[PDB]
Structure formats: C-alpha cells, structure tokens
Amino acid sequence: SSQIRQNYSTEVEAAVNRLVNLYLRASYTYLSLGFYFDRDDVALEGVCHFFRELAEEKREGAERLLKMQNQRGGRALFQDLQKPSQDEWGTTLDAMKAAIVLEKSLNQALLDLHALGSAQADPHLCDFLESHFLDEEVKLIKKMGDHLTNIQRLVGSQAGLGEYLFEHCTL
Amino acid sequence: SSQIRQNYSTEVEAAVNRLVNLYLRASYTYLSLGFYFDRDDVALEGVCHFFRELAEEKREGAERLLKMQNQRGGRALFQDLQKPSQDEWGTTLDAMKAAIVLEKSLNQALLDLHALGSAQADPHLCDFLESHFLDEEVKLIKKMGDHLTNIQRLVGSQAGLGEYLFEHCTL
Amino acid sequence: SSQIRQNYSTEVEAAVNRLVNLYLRASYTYLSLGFYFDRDDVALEGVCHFFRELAEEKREGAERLLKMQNQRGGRALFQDLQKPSQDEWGTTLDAMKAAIVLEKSLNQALLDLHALGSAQADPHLCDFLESHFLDEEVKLIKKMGDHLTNIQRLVGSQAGLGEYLFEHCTL
Amino acid sequence: SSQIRQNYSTEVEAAVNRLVNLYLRASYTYLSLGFYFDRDDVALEGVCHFFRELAEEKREGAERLLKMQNQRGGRALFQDLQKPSQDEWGTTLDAMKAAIVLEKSLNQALLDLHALGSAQADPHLCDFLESHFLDEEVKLIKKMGDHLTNIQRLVGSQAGLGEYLFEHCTL
Ligand SMILES: [Au+]
Ligand SMILES: [Au+]
Ligand SMILES: [Au+]
Ligand SMILES: [Au+]
Ligand SMILES: [Au+]
Ligand SMILES: [Au+]
Ligand SMILES: [Au+]
Ligand SMILES: [Au+]
Ligand SMILES: [Au+]
Ligand SMILES: [Au+]
Ligand SMILES: [Au+]
Ligand SMILES: [Au+]
Ligand SMILES: [Au+]
Ligand SMILES: [Au+]
Ligand SMILES: [Au+]
Ligand SMILES: [Au+]
Ligand SMILES: [Au+]
Ligand SMILES: [Au+]
Ligand SMILES: [Au+]
Ligand SMILES: [Au+]
Ligand SMILES: [Au+]
Ligand SMILES: [Au+]
Ligand SMILES: [Au+]
Ligand SMILES: [Au+]
Ligand SMILES: [Au+]
Ligand SMILES: [Au+]
Ligand SMILES: [Au+]
Ligand SMILES: [Au+]
Ligand SMILES: [Cl-]
Ligand SMILES: [Cl-]
Ligand SMILES: [Cl-]
Ligand SMILES: [Cl-]
Ligand SMILES: [Cl-]
Ligand SMILES: [Cl-]
Ligand SMILES: [Cl-]
Ligand SMILES: [Cl-]
C-alpha cells in the first residue's frame, strides 16, 4: 500500500522496473568486460578500469531508478539478470563496439520511457530522466565514439599512429 | 505596462497568481499547525519546528513564483488569504495526515499549471516548475508518508514501538 | 590461454565461478531487502541502510574472487543471476532471519570450497579464503544473531523493551 | 644446541636451508639480468631497475627464511651459490620468460615445502609461508605474465602497438 502515490501510472511503474533490469544487466555486462581485460593473456588494465567504472555507473543508475520508484509510491519488482551475451570480448575495438551497442540500447529505453511518461502526462518522470539520464548518456556515447575513432586510427596504420601521437604527446 | 513580455499568456499569468495564493495559504496553515504543537497542553516542540520550517518553505515558494511573474512581465495580483481549515489540529497523526492532504493539493496545482503551460506552449514555465517545484514536492510527500508510517507504528503497538527503536536506536 | 597457471585445478576454477554467482546473488537479495525497507509504507531507513551496505560487501566479495581467478590464470564464467526469493520481506525480524539463512549458505559454500582446495592441495586458495572470507563471515553472522536477539526482545514485551533501553540508553 | 626447538622436524629444517639457497640463487640471477640491461649496447634502464628490485625482494625472502630458521631453533647451513644459467639474456621477451620460469620454480619449491610441513604437522611453518610467500609469489607471477603479454603485443605488430598505446596513453 502507498499513501503518497499521485499521477503515477501502472504503465510507468512497470516500465521503470524493466529499466532497472536493463541497467543492472548492463552493469553485469561491464563487469564481464572489465575482468576479461584483466586476464593475463589480455592484460590491458586501463581497459579493465574503464569498464569497471562503467559497471559502477550503471549500477548507480539502477539504484537511482529504484529510489525514484519508492519516492513516487511504486513498487520495485526484480527479475532474473541474464548473463552477458559473450564470455570473451575479443579486441579493444570489438569491446568498444559492443559497449556503444549497449549504450545505444539504454538510450533508446530512456527515450521510450520519456514517450510513455509524455503519453501519461507525468512531468516528474520527464524531469527525472533529464536530471540524471539523458545528457549523461549522450556524453558517454560521444566519449565512446571518440574512443572508437582513436582505436581504429591506432590499430589501422602508421600515418594513423603518427597523427595520434602528435595530438596526444605534442599537443 | 511591460516591454519584456514574450510568449506569456494571460491564462498562465492568472494561474500563477492563483498558485501564489495557494502557497501563501499553505504557509498560513503550517503557521497554525506549528503554534498548536507549541501549546503547553500539547508541547511537542519537535513537531512545532517541523511545521515552522514548512511554513517558511511554502512562503519561499510563493516568493519564487512572484519573482518569476515579474521576470516574464506578468502582474502580481493578491487575494484574501483564507484562514486555515481548523483552529486545533488533534494528534500528531491527525496533523501529519492534514499536511499530506495539503501537499497533495499543491502538487495537483503544480501538475495543473504544467498542463496549462504545455497547452500554451510555454517551455520557460515548464522549466521553472521542474527546477524549483516538482521534485521538491515529491521529496516532501515521500518524507511525510514515511513519517505517517512511523507515527502509525509507534502509536499502534509494542511490537511497532520495538521495531522502531531497533531501527532508530540500534541502527 | 594462460602462461601463469600453476597448481590451479579445473575443479577449483569451476567452484570459484559458482561462488562468484552465489555472492552476486546475495548482493541482489540485499538490494531487494534494502529497497523494501525504503517503501513509504515500511519506512525503516536504518534497516534500508543496513542491507544496502551488505549488498555492497557481497559485490566486493564477488569482485575479490574474480580478481583471484585471474591472478591464478583461471577464467571467469558468468551465469544468470536468479532474482531474489521474495518480492516483499515482511517484518524486520523476518528480514533478519532471511539474512542469516543467506549468510549461513555463503559460509557453507566457503567451507565447501576449503574442502575442495584441501583435497586438491591448493594452499594459495585456502590462504585466500582465510584472508578475506572465513572470519568476515563469522563476524557478520555473530552481528546478525545479536540483531535477531535484540529484535525478538524489543518486539516481544515491555520487560524486553525495558532491558534493551537500560543497555542502550543508560549503558 | 637449542633450548627452544618444538615441533620442528629435521626434514623441514633441511628443506628451509635448501629454500634459502634457491632464493639467494634467484637473487643472483636477477642481479645478472639487471646489469645485462644496463650494458651500453642494450640500454633499457627500466628493465635494469625491474630486475634490480626483484634481486632485492629475493634476498629479503632468503633473510626472512633465515630469521624463521633461528626463531624455530633450527640451524642455518649455507651452500655454494651456483652462478646464473646465462651470461647474456637476449631480448626483453627472452628475459621476462626466463624470469617467469625462475618464479615458477620458486613457487613449486614453496608448494613442496607446504606439502612437507603438512606431512610433519607443522602449522607454524604453513602460517609463515602464507604470511610472507604464497600470495606474494602469485601476485608477482601475474604481473610477469601481464608483462609477457604486453611485450609480445608490442614487439609483434602495428595493431598490437596501437592497442597498447590506446590503453597506456589514452586510458
Ligand atoms: Au576490471
Ligand atoms: Au581494472
Ligand atoms: Au518525457
Ligand atoms: Au512528461
Ligand atoms: Au601521447
Ligand atoms: Au607524450
Ligand atoms: Au607520450
Ligand atoms: Au512552531
Ligand atoms: Au518550534
Ligand atoms: Au509543462
Ligand atoms: Au511546456
Ligand atoms: Au532511537
Ligand atoms: Au538511541
Ligand atoms: Au535512543
Ligand atoms: Au536501501
Ligand atoms: Au538506506
Ligand atoms: Au582450505
Ligand atoms: Au589447502
Ligand atoms: Au538507547
Ligand atoms: Au538514550
Ligand atoms: Au535513548
Ligand atoms: Au640493474
Ligand atoms: Au637499473
Ligand atoms: Au602447509
Ligand atoms: Au601445516
Ligand atoms: Au602510454
Ligand atoms: Au601517453
Ligand atoms: Au604516452
Ligand atoms: Cl571490472
Ligand atoms: Cl508530460
Ligand atoms: Cl510555527
Ligand atoms: Cl511546452
Ligand atoms: Cl538498498
Ligand atoms: Cl592444502
Ligand atoms: Cl641490477
Ligand atoms: Cl599442519
């Protein structure tokens, strides 16, 4: 029971529980990514730390959603967390591509949740997504695309490697 | 006269004046609540201070609205402030229930103002309500509902009182 | 492939992956427990914070195991995380009993892993469990049993409540 | 003569003297490795410093064993230190492979000493190996395997070199 619920549709409440599941799944994905790069036969600890920090941010996003669910008087319902889609993640390039795919899917889920909140005339929900999720996700995707470009440049060629060093080491 | 007014409908201007009245009324309600709990025959100074702080927050909300009215080039119009609905407020439980009723009514007025601003295509108004009012009101209502649950638990029973002390004193 | 693996049996490697799954499951359980106590109709924030901290400790335990798996040259394999066994957790007493059941099961898994490491003559594994898991788990279970006794005393009776206050407030 | 010896078998006492010899031999190996990389025609001072620090750690391990031998009432007996197996150590890759071979052999000697202490029911010995040697050796081997992977990646190819720079310079 709740004595506080106001203007909070069952549709949104359900969608928020699904979004918590997606965020926790993504956190689990990034946990797997990070420990893959910590393998002795891979050994790119910087890549390990990049994904470890993303695992933490996606868990924090889920916790924010759960806190909001309780603030509106909705009820958290948890489902199974499906294991990540791969057990080994290939090259740095492969892993950064998988990460962008994952983030695009979370972004689309955020946009879908906004469409539902708009249809339900739920401005608190909209505000919440704007305050904590929409711009954070755009920033992250921009950083990943920048990373993808630089991995491609570096693994591709000696001119590529040259331009990278000029920017990174001289500038 | 105004030389600055742009995209600011007479409907919104009127609705904002009504919302100032509601906020000032709520401030007056909380003033009455607080001094009731300061009576020698009631003497719950912590409850007095809780309502005294709410009186201050509701006055501040009204002042924010008035400042916004002037920033958009609308004209503040004041009406009578109706005295609060009771002269004595009963138990702590009774008073917390009345407070949640009051906050729900302010929240609904905020949602109604958003619906009007949306119909008038007034995004500055929407932004304003998001920046200062929607999440503040949800947070406050959540706190009041938490309080209601704890008052009910405490006044209800020895098991209730027991669980409360474990949480509050041990944890 | 690994160039470092030495004295690390496939049986232990598999058992460690299963133990990571159990720890992550327990973390997920505690996440559900904590947000249950944050509901407006439950509203025991101290209990919420107790379980929130346990969720963090169980995730940290899983991460320690994963780091150890990589240090020995074993390969992390993740499975589905089954959702927690309940959606609502009843009283504080009910929830503390469920927590002790959960911790007893992790403790038994640690003891089973020691039995396997002993049979495989793997002293590094034994050392690892001693350094990070066995005494931590005994300490936690002792704290939970202490909590269970105090909840029982407090919810049970006016003599019980009296003895608790003497200890907590006077001493 | 000793007035303190208790539960300290002649077998363990002998094995500990042999382990001191192995540790001092390894220290001597690393001394040779380090000065090889300081040659003007090799000139990788970072590699020199890596091996110089390992020479120091292996000497410290021997000194710890000798101190323990005296604490149990056993008698240190020293043998010849055989010169290192090579006079020149080839590439960085060659030298890191030789180092991992050396560390694997010390690790196996530690495991063999644990097997003997277990057969002799000598828990102080076991504790000692756990406190100062088993996890230190696993950590070191993990670091060396990580190094081997990164040397292989770097000396192998332009894609390899690219991935390394992304991790090391960008992340
Ligand atoms: Au990682
Ligand atoms: Au890392
Ligand atoms: Au929206
Ligand atoms: Au909306
Ligand atoms: Au650079
Ligand atoms: Au540079
Ligand atoms: Au550089
Ligand atoms: Au007052
Ligand atoms: Au007061
Ligand atoms: Au609006
Ligand atoms: Au609007
Ligand atoms: Au208390
Ligand atoms: Au207390
Ligand atoms: Au207290
Ligand atoms: Au919580
Ligand atoms: Au909490
Ligand atoms: Au063991
Ligand atoms: Au063992
Ligand atoms: Au107390
Ligand atoms: Au007290
Ligand atoms: Au007290
Ligand atoms: Au050197
Ligand atoms: Au050096
Ligand atoms: Au042993
Ligand atoms: Au032993
Ligand atoms: Au670098
Ligand atoms: Au760099
Ligand atoms: Au660099
Ligand atoms: Cl990680
Ligand atoms: Cl809306
Ligand atoms: Cl007052
Ligand atoms: Cl609008
Ligand atoms: Cl929590
Ligand atoms: Cl063993
Ligand atoms: Cl040296
Ligand atoms: Cl023993």
Cβ C123–D111 below 8 Å, yes or no?
A: yes
The encoded tokens of residue C148 equal 């269970």
Separation of alpha carbons D5 and D119, rounded Å:
18
D140 interface with C at CB cutoff 8 Å:
no
Cα distance between residue C22 and residue C62, in whole Å = 8
Six-digit token string for B159: 């098991």
Strand, coil or helix: A81: strand
Contacts of D47 (CB under 8 A, 6+ apart): D34, D37, D92, D95
For residue C121, give the nearest of D115, D126, D135 by CB distance: D115
List the end-to-end C-alpha distance of chain A, in Å, as a whole number.
60
Q: What's the A5 CA to ligand 3 centre distance in angstroms? A: 19
Dihedral angle computed from the Cα positions of residues C8, C14, C17 and C23, in that order, rounded to the nearest 10 degrees: -100
C/B Cβ contact: 3+ pairs below 8 Å: yes
Q: Which residues contact B25 (CB under 8 A, 6 or more apart)?
A: B81, B82, B84
Are B171 and C50 within 8 A, CB to CB? yes
C63 among the known binding-site residues? yes
Structure tokens at A170: 């001289």
DSSP annotation string for B9-63: -HHHHHHHHHHHHHHHHHHHHHHHHHHHHTSTTT--HHHHHHHHHHHHHHHHHHH
Q: Which DSSP string do the residues of C76-138 spell out, in sequence order? A: -----BPPPS-S---SHHHHHHHHHHHHHHHHHHHHHHHHHHHHTT-HHHHHHHIIIIIHHHH
The residue in chain D having the minimum alpha-carbon distance to the alpha carbon of residue C71 is D142
| Inter-chain CB proximity C67 and A38 less than 8 Å | yes
A121 contacts B134? CB cut-off 8 A: no
Closest listed ligand to the CA of A165? 5
Task: Determine if residue B95 is left, alpha or beta; phi over 0 gives left, psi from -120 to 50 gives alpha, anything else beta.
Answer: alpha
Instruction: Point out which residues pair with A81 in neighbouring strands.
Output: C81
**H helix and E strand count, chain D:** 6, 0
CA A92 to ligand 27 center in whole angstroms: 17
Q: Are B91 and B150 in contact (CB under 8 A)?
A: no
Amino acid code (one letter) for C71:
Q
Q: Which residues contact residue C94 at a Cβ distance below 8 angstroms, ignoring those fewer than 6 apart?
A: none
Specify whether the CB–CB gap between A62 and A23 falls below 8 A. Answer: yes
Cα of B101 to nearest chain C Cα, Å: 16
What letter represents residue C68's amino acid? Answer: M
Q: Which residue from B78, B100, B71, B96 is spatially nearest to B19, judged by alpha carbons?
A: B78
Ligand 15 centroid distance, CA of C95 (Å): 13
Task: Output the furthest CA–CA distance in chain B (Å, rounded).
Answer: 66
C74 contacts chain A (CB < 8 A): no
List CB contacts (< 8 A) between B93 and chain A: none
- Residue A91 zone, left/alpha/beta (φ > 0; ψ -120 to 50; rest): beta
For residues D133 and D135, what is the distance between their CA atoms, to the nearest angstrom?
6
Q: Which residues in chain A are closer than 8 Å to C66, comparing Cβ atoms?
A: 31, 35
Chain C touched by A4 (CB under 8 Å): yes
A6 close to B108: Cβ distance less than 8 angstroms: yes
- Name chain D contacts of C131, Cβ cutoff 8 Å: 135
Q: Does A10 touch chain B (CB under 8 A)?
A: no
Strand-pairing partners, residue C81, are: A81
The phi, psi pair for C20, rounded to 5°, reads -60, -45
Interface A:D, Cβ pairs < 8 A: 59
Of D146, D162, D170, the CB nearest to A155: D162
Q: Would you say B153 and B164 are in contact if contact means Cβ atoms under 8 Å apart?
A: yes
Q: Do residue A164 and residue D165 have CB atoms under 8 angstroms apart?
A: yes
A20 with A62: CB under 8 angstroms? Answer: yes
- Whether A80 and C79 lie within 8 Å, measured CB to CB: no
For the record, the structure tokens of C143 come out as: 């704290």
Q: How far apart are CA D128 and CA A160, in angstroms?
A: 53
Question: What's domain A10-170's architecture?
Answer: Up-down Bundle (1.20)
Q: How far apart are CA D147 and CA D156, in angstroms?
A: 14
Residue count of chain C, please give it.
Answer: 171
CB atoms within 10 A of CB A80: 12
Which residue of chain C is at minimal alpha-carbon distance from A70? C39
For residue B87, the SS3 value is coil
C3 touches chain D (CB under 8 A): yes
- Interface contact flag, C4 D134, Cβ < 8 Å: no
Mutate to test the interface with A, among B113, B127, B141, B152 (most CBs of A within 10 A): B141
In this structure, the number of other CB atoms found within 10 A of the CB of residue B168 comes to 13
Q: Which residue of A has its CA nearest to B149?
A: A3
Measured over the CA atoms of residue B117, residue B118, residue B124 and residue B125, the dihedral's sign is positive
Ligand nearest to the CA of C164: 19
Is residue A98 classed exposed, middle or buried when 0-12, 13-18 and 19+ CB atoms within 10 A define those classes?
A: middle
Cα–Cα distance between B52 and B31 in angstroms, integer?
A: 6
For residue D150, what are the contacts with CB-CB under 8 A and spacing of at least 6?
A43, D164
Lookup: tokens for C39: 């509901």
Residue A48's closest chain D neighbor by CA? D167
Give CA–CA dist D126/D114, Å, rounded. 6
Where is the binding site for Fe cation, in residues of B? 53, 56-57, 60, 63
D126, D130, D138 ranked by CB distance to C71: nearest: D138
Annotated binding residue C163: no
Residues C142-169 as b or e (16 or more Cβ within 10 Å = b): eebeebbebbebbbeeeebbeebeeeee
Shortest CA gap C66–chain D (Å): 14
What does the block give as tokens for C158? 């006016």
Which of C40, C155, C168 is closest, CB to CB, to B159?
C155
Q: Tell me the C-alpha distance between C52 and C38, whole Å.
A: 10
3-state helix vs strand vs coil in chain D, percent to 5: 75, 0, 25
The residues near A92 (Cβ < 8 Å, ≥ 6 apart) are A37, A44, A47, A151, A155, D163, D166, D167
Whole-angstrom Cα distance, residue A67 to residue A64? 5
Q: Quote the tokens at residue C104.
A: 């007893």
Q: What separation in Å is there between the alpha carbon of A139 and the centre of ligand 3?
A: 19
Closest CA to D171 of A44, A88, A28, A38: A44
**Best residue of B96, B132, B142, B149 to probe chain A, by most A CBs closer than 10 Å:** B142
Give the whole-angstrom CA distance, residue C53 versus residue C62.
15
Give the chain A residue nearest B100 (alpha carbons). A4
CA dist., res. B23 & res. A22, Å (int): 40
Question: Quick one: D150 exposed, middle or buried, by C-beta within 10 A (0-12, 13-18, 19+)?
Answer: buried
Q: How far is D76 from chain C (nearest CA, A)?
A: 26
**Domain boundaries in chain C?**
10-170
Which ligand minimizes its atom distance to the CA of B113?
10
Three-state SS string over D45-57 comes to: HHHHHHHHHHHHH
Q: Which residues contact B100 (CB under 8 A, 6 or more apart)?
A: A3, A4, B141, B144, B145, B148
Which chains lie within 8 Å of chain A at 3 or more CB pairs, if any?
A: B, C, D
Q: Give yes or no for a contact between B65 and B22, defined as CB atoms under 8 angstroms apart.
A: no
Interchain contact, B108 vs A6, CB within 8 Å: yes
CA B118 to chain centre: 23
Backbone conformation region of residue A121, classed left if phi is above 0, alpha if psi is from -120 to 50, else beta: left
Q: Which residues of C touch B162 (CB under 8 A)?
A: 151, 154-156, 160-161
Note the Cα B158 to chain centre separation in Å. 33
Nearest to A30 by CA among A92, A98, A93, A94: A98
With beta carbons less than 8 A apart as the criterion, state whether B113 and B15 touch. yes
Q: Which ligand is nearest to the CA of C55?
A: 33
